[PDB]
């Protein structure tokens, strides 16, 4: 069924809350035993958001290999994503270790450091060229190279140095700066514009390790970004737009990380973004 007609049918019947609960009911349930170990309690922002053991990203150290991060591997689309929580004051060094070890080119940030008057994640990148950050626990240095501030988003160029080997890489930071908590990113236009800027950077391409994507918990807004990207890619790979079931792609993604898409409004917005973005994919 053409999703654009499924859309209008759900809208006219007002059954978004009912579709959403059907997804919640059919969603995979896998163990998260490492996340729940007592040594890892201060590595988790939220008690009810954990990575599954089978898909969790492992840090390359014997001490404690744990970070609240998941590898989402989409086989047919040939895309991978790392979805993670907003880093904590004590996990900022683990976050940049993961970026280094996984060979990511891009970090996509979909939240503000403060929302609704509370801190949603640590200030994990330098705000001034001349004030670089050193992460002593993981032996990394991070420097702001340049910053490009637009109306809906900011792009930053960062330099990541492994202080152990003196190897250096440029990492791109894509910061979507106007998405409300459990809210919807305005209208498909600014969201899709931001997605196409990440794609044009090379950050999502197979010559690079997986993009790192986060919001506060790494499931809501983060889920919307990778669902919309993957559904548009599947329309392209076969150029048969009808052969895309958004609910089935979401359930496939939920085998790798729990809770992706947090509200029935986020589900509806994901549909809008895919339907409007297809009007480019199909040759316009
Ligand atoms: C070592 C390496 O090549 C690399 C691996 C992963 C992420 C970033 C990088 S660095 C990079 C990637 C693309 C374009 C320019 C640069 C740059 O170094 O300016």
Swiss-Prot record:
Any one Gene Ontology cellular component term annotated for this protein: cytoplasmic side of endoplasmic reticulum membrane
Could you tell me in which tissues this protein is expressed? Answer: Expressed in keratinocytes (at protein level).
> Which residues make up the binding site for substrate?
181, 215-221, 262
- Sites where Cysteine sulfenic acid (-SOH) occurs are at 215
What's the stated role of this polypeptide?
A: Tyrosine-protein phosphatase which acts as a regulator of endoplasmic reticulum unfolded protein response. Mediates dephosphorylation of EIF2AK3/PERK; inactivating the protein kinase activity of EIF2AK3/PERK. May play an important role in CKII- and p60c-src-induced signal transduction cascades. May regulate the EFNA5-EPHA3 signaling pathway which modulates cell reorganization and cell-cell repulsion. May also regulate the hepatocyte growth factor receptor signaling pathway through dephosphorylation of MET.
Assembly, per entry: Interacts with EPHA3 (phosphorylated); dephosphorylates EPHA3 and may regulate its trafficking and function. Interacts with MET. Interacts with NCK1.
Q: What is this protein called?
A: Tyrosine-protein phosphatase non-receptor type 1
Q: Which gene encodes it?
A: PTPN1
Boundaries of the shown chain within the full protein: 1 to 284 of 435
């Amino acid at each position: 069924m053409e999703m654009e007609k499924e859309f209008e049918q759900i809208d006219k019947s007002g059954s978004w809350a009912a579709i959403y609960q059907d997804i919640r009911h059919e969603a995979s349930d896998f163990p998260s035993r490492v996340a729940k170990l007592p040594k890892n309690k201060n590595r988790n922002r939220y008690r009810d958001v954990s990575p599954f053991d089978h898909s969790r990203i492992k840090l390359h150290q014997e001490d404690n290999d744990y970070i609240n991060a998941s590898l989402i591997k989409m086989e047919e689309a040939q895309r991978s994503y790392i979805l993670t929580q907003g880093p904590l004051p004590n996990t900022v060094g683990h976050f940049w270790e993961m970026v280094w070890e996984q060979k990511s080119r891009g970090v996509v940030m979909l939240n503000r450091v403060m929302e609704k008057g509370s801190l949603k994640c640590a200030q994990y990148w330098p705000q001034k060229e001349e004030k670089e950050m050193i992460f002593e626990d993981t032996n990394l240095k991070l420097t702001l190279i340049s910053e490009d501030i637009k109306s809906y988003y900011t792009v930053r160029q960062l330099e990541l140095e492994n202080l152990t080997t003196q190897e250096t890489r440029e990492i791109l930071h894509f910061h979507y700066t106007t998405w409300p908590d459990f809210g919807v990113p305005e209208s498909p236009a600014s969201f899709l514009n931001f997605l196409f800027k990440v794609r044009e950077s090379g950050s999502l391409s197979p010559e690079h390790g997986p993009v790192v994507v986060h919001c506060s918990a790494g499931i809501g807004r983060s889920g919307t970004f990778c669902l919309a990207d993957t559904c548009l890619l599947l329309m392209d790979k076969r150029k048969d737009p009808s052969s895309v079931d958004i609910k089935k792609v979401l359930l496939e993604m939920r085998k790798f990380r729990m809770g992706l898409i947090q509200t029935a409004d986020q589900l509806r917005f994901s549909y809008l973004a895919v339907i409007e973005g297809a009007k480019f994919i199909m040759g316009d």
